[model samples]
Target: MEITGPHTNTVIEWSNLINTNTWLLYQKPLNSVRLLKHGPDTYNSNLAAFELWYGKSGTTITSVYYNTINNQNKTHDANSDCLILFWNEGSTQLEKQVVTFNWNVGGILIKPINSSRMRICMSGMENFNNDSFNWENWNHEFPRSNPGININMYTEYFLASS
Candidate 1:
């Protein structure tokens, strides 16, 4: 979402806050599937776009850091800027082993913004379905404390305006 304000308050603090509704929805269980063989050809790049489908090296995580290097708005001009991967409880660290595509993307988890608990909780899909995956029921949470209903509409507006 386009959040414009002073760099210290809005950009630094407020921008990083999670949308409680999005966080709650993402917390919900969705149909997650796994690949039998994640051959060498995995990762995001012009050649192989598997990272777009799955996090780099299949590192399931939620909330990606935007332009950590440049400190600019990396999400602008994109519809789906980040991918949300729910961690299965009991799992510890992420699978940081890198899988090469066309370029290099870190297999390690940088900053676990929204679903920091997901990574810590190690929540994952109990079972992967062989058929289609349904994520309609997927619920996430807002970064700040707010009523779910209001946060839900706010998130929708945030997406639309962005």
Candidate 2:
């Protein structure tokens, strides 16, 4: 996904939709999984890697900032330019808090928490606060409205593109 015209966006948003999608289709869960996004175009050496604590288990899902340093084990690249795990929700606030991974390895450790809302969104980019933007739209990404669809591809395109 690319953009141009002196404007565009900075983000990587993905959800474990396949999990629930299959469960709904077959009636059995896919157990657990790990996802990583990395591209040579995204490689950066000057970038610094760090993790701030977010996602702590609670009821229904937490809507508050953890505000504590996650104290990850280590970075995959030392300069983990492959961005993952950042702010989510349109001001969605921490809609889900089941994220737990080792500073471990690979990329940002993200898992699935089933329900009508598996509620696991992770993203990162260098801009818009010069950081990352996970997700803010449950549906409505484009066309300005929901339009009525449980699984519809709406294009919101978010704030700025430049």
Candidate 3:
């Protein structure tokens, strides 16, 4: 998704600007998944990775989960810190507290308590002994809006090519 001309429009705004036959399709439920993986070269030299899956069917939210992998390559069930910007929703919140890998079964099972949107973020706790977790270190937003069909295709393209 590239934008020319100086503009303040967001992705969804841009999509609406360009009329198309399938414009409404963009508004349809995004039965999609997102994966973010970064090693030491990024974000305070702390490795991070996670797979987030979410979608909506009619008025019902179908599924949500975060499968996280840490610096040691050990997997842990990632749940929302649910504080500040990532405050867990009563409806879209996960079912359990964060659990260390040893006691975890799989990725944390997120339940849509009552929210219509969901998002998650995680990073290696830098300065482990001194720093407390903050949005600056692992920033995020929730009730995330859909980025429209065109934008969605751009991601799908790279994902498929890779």
Candidate 4:
């Protein structure tokens, strides 16, 4: 076996199932994507900036961020809207140039995976990280009694953004 460089192949896939009862934020939880910023450098793969995902809870409209490296908490939720762009400061320390990141969601997606749209949940979550060894995330929970809710409506980011 051998390692390769410019491993920027855009054909990799990941998938998984996340239980909203794990992290339980706003009555939700279960997403293995932590540290949204500079951890990939430590993960041994200089990949950075992943795309796709949405994660939130409660009637919360919006939130804020603090100085932290464990971005796995609030970096890229993993999806169309949650694209974590690695800031290639070019001159920053504790860093390199081969940016790498997990499109972590476990496996990948079957439905609602790709359509050039964004998904949103309130009390739960969505993700391709069903394997814990992958990357991906999304959300738009509706009920608490039925912690496992599902929705697949076609929507665009432009319709709601304006």
| lDDT (0 to 1) per candidate | 0.21, 0.24, 0.23, 0.23
Give candidate 1's whole-model lDDT. 0.21
Kindly report which residue stretches of model 3 are placed more than 4 angstroms away from their true locations once superposed.
Answer: 1-99, 113-115, 119-141, 145-162
- Residue 4's lDDT in candidate 3: 29
Lowest-sum lDDT 10-residue window in model 1: 151-160
TM-score of each: 0.20, 0.19, 0.19, 0.17
lDDT of 1 by residue, 6-77 (tens): 122111122332333112111111222121111112221111111111233324332231112232222222
Please, what are the lDDT tens digits per residue for candidate 3 over residues 62-115?
Answer: 111222312222222233211111123334333222211221111221222223
Q: Provide the lDDT at 2 for model 4.
A: 24
- Once fitted onto the true fold, the runs of candidate 2 whose alpha carbons sit more than 4 angstroms away are 1-84, 90-105, 119-162
Q: What are the root-mean-square deviations of the candidates from the true structure over C-alphas? A: 16.2, 18.0, 17.2, 19.1
- Which candidate leads the pack in TM-score? 1
- Candidate ranking under TM-score, highest first, comes to 1, 3, 2, 4
lDDT of 4 at 32: 23
Q: What are the clash counts of all predictions, listed in order?
A: 30, 15, 4, 60
Local error of candidate 1 at 44, Å? 33
